[PDB]
């Protein structure tokens, strides 16, 4: 997170305790006829820090791949979620039978790259996009 | 087997067939199993797990590729496993030639994109010439080289990228950078892999100059990984540091700029290989030559050429200290995955000849790469190295077995590493041996925390460093519960 | 800076480690030093081919300790054999301080430092070093002013640490500031090792050699008598004597002059001697007769 | 199947093939014995070693 | 009579067992070496013992043992007429 930002917020919280404390103490409840003491009006100060949350979720083993029982769609050349290391089987699932990529065999697509046919079906537009363009 | 044939289960068939060791039997004695995904893939792993005998395994894998090749749909998974494991041209060539008949242009591409990630990088170059003859449905070349392929992965890496510079800024700004300099550059180099973070490097030019010694080399060197497969920015960044454009700073910075260049363009080497080749001839001296030597070997993978081997071999003979280390690694990279007697000879013999420490380490890893998927043939080599007079040579044997045996986990390989470790009190051999185990065992990764624990208990904290490593590699794609807890007391220990 | 400055591992040959130790030991308690003769290879390897000592004195490990007479004389010998060497650096022993540099050492360390940035001051095990397994470390000494400029971190890089304390935190502070226990490896080959392993040629005869039978028979008799005494003490003990703490055990299971231990020592010595003495005599008799 | 229940045929009927499974399981039963004693023996040496390590580190 | 899928399930029991047996064979090799590892640890030990031996030798001061309060630390009176609470090297009996 970086500390720099965190210091700024700690000082801003403090201003509040100082201001309430100031007025309240000043009122004489021990030099008027009534005495209920002015020492009971002893407040203290506060600050604010923050640090990243630790929370282990979807852990079968400490750092498997974190197996979800539920699936989502991810686009080629993207993790819309964030993918997890080493699942050859859980990537591919069943290829979608409405997409412009479909094929002759199902689930022949691990995270080692594959390019399915468009002979089988064409529907959705094809997007080619290397970094070739950016390089040269 | 006939009761089994009658039930019509392929899964039962491979298991029994295995026991018998007969090829016709594995396919089904009269062919009736035609499922292409699932059960078929399972056998290949089964044959590897139980058996430790290559010859029969290579025959089974190969027979299974040909029987499916006759079928209209072959699978791309089955040829990729043979291709790495056998180090045989045939498996991929057989399926792609049938594909000509089909004129599924599309099918051929799918196999090729797959081939590049999975298979040996060096091996792909030899495969290209033979595929052209059998015929394709040429267009194949761009993907198999890896030029096209790498560029598509770069759009993936860059868009998703998220990881800030800010951590690096605070420490560098606060106090003088020399030791801190090393710390910044490796963390920085690794995080921004395949994305544009040239931003930091370019303004904080001053950052690299303040450094000294090896840290200095490491700083310029670090850049290449960040700019992996950017052909745009790669040349520009490296220029400052090179005598190409002013303010080179020192020899360390120039050497590191060549190393970075070799890293960026590796595995599709085009225009860059010829410049670094000329530079190799020309300089042939210490700190500058180290990076150039290293890069040259990397650039050569995935296009091949003999010329790179000879030049690294002459460079090694001359007895330059710094560059010798790079030379050794690079000889192992070029020849790779076929076995070459010259490569193994030159690196092994040279170790004995030099008393210079940098050169030694470099060779020791180097002999290991070229032996990749030899299996049993590596045994004779590790034993010799271990038998040798020098303690450094004993470490070089451990490398040899580590690379070769992967893709199996066998009894044979483990027994000799351990042997070295007990016989010798010596701190280096014990630590060395423990790492190599974790690689052999990652084909049943659960075994590794049990064996590594025993060794960590020892009096030498040296062994413990290796113990940490052994676990890491084994579990590196996906791990276990046990692997993490073993590592955890060592993190707390105050031995550095 | 385009400056080298880093930690230097010392590659010690077999003649050089044994010789330095010998000097150090001979020298006790007076501080003794000597030069390291060698060749430099690589870019942090400083190799000690050989060493010679500067005379044993109460004035040593000073710039006064190095004599031109001994150094020249010693160098001249090497030439006839045809060995060219350069002064790679210097070694010393402090047997009234640890394996750290001391204040008297600093002047000498500085002169060699200025001359060769690749000359180190090596402290060699004498018998005073508390953390002594024959751990030899080589250090260079800088001052505080240099450290804040950032000269100090360069020196520390590229070495494996290890903690020692043979003389409290003051030693440790200097130890970190220097290089911080630099790694020493030894250059050896199998042929040299084997010469060091065997005590003598004579083991061949001696291993076979037996005393007098009468004396062997006496040994057996002496132990038995000894064991017989301990026996009474074992008998009460057996009821527990698996317990922690010797103070508690003293009353319970006769932990005062522990019978288990006494009996085990008596049994080990008796055993090995009787078999070896029987075996030898009997084997020799069949070959000779 | 079981280690019980006689039935006719074996040529391709398949009761024999299942019956062989019950015998295949006898083979693992032979093997389970070697393995437990190997774990116990390794453990014996580890106890002794852990005890030796503790002294040196200490 | 069988022609069902049941021989697949029966196969699996055997298939899992064979890989598990293989893991154990790795452990067999390790059992032989670990007996050797002890012998090497004893070698390291003996060299490590030389380290305690240096403190055990001069310079030494002579004291007199008042009594042992516990194993790891005790109460002693040195020959200076000053008493110190000090540690016991490798829990002397």
UniProtKB/Swiss-Prot annotation, chain A:
Region Disordered: start-end pairs: 22-64, 113-136
Modified residues (Phosphothreonine): 13
Residues carrying Phosphoserine: 17
Endpoints of the signal sequence: none
Biased composition (Basic and acidic residues): 25-35, 42-55
TM segment ranges: none
Biased composition (Acidic residues): 119-136
Role noted for this protein: Component of the 26S proteasome, a multiprotein complex involved in the ATP-dependent degradation of ubiquitinated proteins. This complex plays a key role in the maintenance of protein homeostasis by removing misfolded or damaged proteins, which could impair cellular functions, and by removing proteins whose functions are no longer required. Therefore, the proteasome participates in numerous cellular processes, including cell cycle progression, apoptosis, or DNA damage repair.
Family statement: Belongs to the proteasome subunit S1 family.
Subunit and partners: Component of the 19S proteasome regulatory particle complex. The 26S proteasome consists of a 20S core particle (CP) and two 19S regulatory subunits (RP). The regulatory particle is made of a lid composed of 9 subunits, a base containing 6 ATPases and few additional components including PSMD1. Interacts with ADRM1. Interacts with ZFAND1.
Record-given protein name: 26S proteasome non-ATPase regulatory subunit 1
Organism in which the protein naturally occurs: Rattus norvegicus (Rat)
Curated annotation (Swiss-Prot), chain D:
Subcellular location as annotated: Cytoplasm; Nucleus
Post-translational modification N-acetylalanine, affected residues: 2
Domain of life the protein comes from: Eukaryota
Role summary: Component of the 26S proteasome, a multiprotein complex involved in the ATP-dependent degradation of ubiquitinated proteins. This complex plays a key role in the maintenance of protein homeostasis by removing misfolded or damaged proteins, which could impair cellular functions, and by removing proteins whose functions are no longer required. Therefore, the proteasome participates in numerous cellular processes, including cell cycle progression, apoptosis, or DNA damage repair.
Family of the protein in this entry: Belongs to the AAA ATPase family.
Subunit structure: Component of the 19S proteasome regulatory particle complex. The 26S proteasome consists of a 20S core particle (CP) and two 19S regulatory subunits (RP). The regulatory particle is made of a lid composed of 9 subunits, a base containing 6 ATPases including PSMC5 and few additional components. Component of a complex with USP49 and RUVBL1. Interacts with PRPF19. Interacts with TRIM5. Interacts with NDC80. Interacts with PAAF1. Interacts, in vitro, with the thyroid hormone receptor (in a thyroid hormone T3-dependent manner) and with retinoid X receptor (RXR). Interacts with ERCC6.
Protein name: 26S proteasome regulatory subunit 8
Full protein segment contained here: 1 to 58 of 406
UniProtKB/Swiss-Prot annotation, chain E:
Modified residues (Phosphoserine): 1
Highest taxon of the lineage: Eukaryota
Subcellular location: Cytoplasm; Nucleus
Stated role: Component of the 26S proteasome, a multiprotein complex involved in the ATP-dependent degradation of ubiquitinated proteins. This complex plays a key role in the maintenance of protein homeostasis by removing misfolded or damaged proteins, which could impair cellular functions, and by removing proteins whose functions are no longer required. Therefore, the proteasome participates in numerous cellular processes, including cell cycle progression, apoptosis, or DNA damage repair.
Subunit: Component of the 19S proteasome regulatory particle complex. The 26S proteasome consists of a 20S core particle (CP) and two 19S regulatory subunits (RP). The regulatory particle is made of a lid composed of 9 subunits, a base containing 6 ATPases including PSMC4 and few additional components. Interacts with NR1I3. Interacts with PAAF1. Interacts with TRIM5. Interacts with ZFAND1.
Similarity comment: family membership: Belongs to the AAA ATPase family.
Stated name of the protein: 26S proteasome regulatory subunit 6B
UniProt source species: Rattus norvegicus (Rat)
Organism phylogeny: Eukaryota, Metazoa, Chordata, Craniata, Vertebrata
Whole sequence portion shown: 28 to 120 of 418
